[PDB]
């Protein structure tokens, strides 16, 4: 029921939680601001950028379990949370896992609009 | 244990068909990538055909395209080439070979596993 | 369209002397390329993969170095079972060429 959430809901998580949602837009930022660099440096940057966005569907997985799946549907500044953790985690895992992808395009912004959705997460947090 | 054995080629009339079966051992082909590459007596090497039977896809050369169709059956683990209307300029010697997927962004693999080579002659 | 220029087209070395292959790429390309050893009459053979990463049962003496858009296969110490030709290729589908290849002949 809601015995992990007594767990989860903790203060020391919830900073540790935005802090990853800062260090994700840190380390993204230093990716983009070393264009070219070593095939195993961008490993590790796509690790994180991977493991960053599988943690924030654990997360939001948490957040469902123990929290109530009703408190989301009447609640604005959560279902357009969750849909852009959804889009953010979809579009991760295709450009990093998923490379089956070889049809047309014109290489598609969504790289780019992931890139900024992961901005509005730090914008709605400072509206909290 | 991983073995591609071909076999199809021989002699055929230019204008004429001719396919190619291409046999895998020791792996799923619905999982991995069969490629065609050709080579003409006393010529370099050249990449012709592919599929993937995982997603569905494949892609040809300009100098066989819309005449080559590259089809596979993963019930008996087989991947096909079909030549259609043979020009003298196909004359050459087939290999197909596997080349599994990458999920990186080194893309980490190559075609390790090459066939045995068949020999495809078009002349009257 | 990525013109593969393997150079030089042939080379003779005597045993035991350092090989250096070369292939330049039209333009940034990545360092995903192989390298194949063909012996005539037989199948092509992978070498190297990914431009630097040895395959499993090939010699010590093959290594594969990247730099800038020219790749490059070296062979250490020739052996006169090194005739053959060696050919460089590219990874993900659909995009892979091959190189114009390179004869190697034994110097004796």
């Known amino acids: 029921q809601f015995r992990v959430r007594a767990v989860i809901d903790h203060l020391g998580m919830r900073v540790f939680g935005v802090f990853l949602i800062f260090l994700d837009i840190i380390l993204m930022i230093i990716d983009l601001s070393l264009p070219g660099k070593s095939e195993s440096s961008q490993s590790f940057y796509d690790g994180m950028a991977l493991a960053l966005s599988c943690y924030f569907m654990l997360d939001l997985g948490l957040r469902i379990f123990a929290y109530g799946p009703k408190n989301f549907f009447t609640n604005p500044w959560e279902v357009a949370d969750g849909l852009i953790i959804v889009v953010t985690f979809v579009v991760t895992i295709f450009y990093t896992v998923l490379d089956e992808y070889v049809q047309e395009t014109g290489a598609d912004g969504l790289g780019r609009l992931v890139v900024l959705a992961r901005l509005l997460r730090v914008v709605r947090l400072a509206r909290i | 244990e991983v073995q591609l054995v071909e076999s199809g080629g021989g002699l055929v009339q230019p204008g004429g068909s001719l396919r190619l079966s291409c046999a895998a051992s020791?792996?799923?082909?619905?999982?991995?990538?069969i490629h065609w590459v050709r080579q003409a007596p006393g010529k370099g090497l050249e990449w012709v055909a592919y599929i993937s039977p995982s997603s569905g896809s494949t892609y040809y050369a300009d100098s066989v395209k819309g005449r080559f169709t590259i089809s596979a059956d993963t019930s008996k683990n087989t991947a096909y080439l079909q030549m259609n209307s043979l020009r003298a300029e196909d004359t050459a010697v087939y290999y197909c070979?596997?080349?599994?997927?990458?999920?990186?962004?080194?893309?980490?693999?190559?075609?390790?596993?090459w066939g045995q080579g068949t020999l495809v002659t078009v002349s009257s | 369209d990525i013109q593969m220029t393997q150079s030089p087209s042939s080379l003779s070395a005597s045993v035991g002397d350092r090989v250096t292959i070369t292939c330049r790429a039209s333009?940034?390309?990545?360092?995903?390329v192989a390298w194949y050893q063909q012996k005539p009459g037989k199948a092509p053979k992978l070498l190297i993969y990914?431009?630097?990463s040895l395959y499993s049962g090939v010699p010590s003496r093959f290594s594969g170095s990247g730099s800038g858009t020219d790749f490059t296969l070296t062979i250490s110490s020739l052996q006169p079972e090194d005739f053959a030709t060696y050919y460089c290729?590219?990874?993900?589908?659909?995009?892979?060429?091959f190189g114009q290849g390179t004869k190697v002949e034994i110097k004796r």
């Open positions: 020791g792996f799923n082909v619905y999982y991995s990538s």
């Open positions: 333009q940034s390309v990545s360092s995903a």
């Open positions: 290729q590219q990874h993900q589908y659909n995009s892979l060429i």
């Open positions: 990914s431009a630097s």
């Open positions: 070979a596997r080349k599994q997927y990458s999920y990186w962004r080194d893309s980490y693999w190559a075609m390790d596993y």
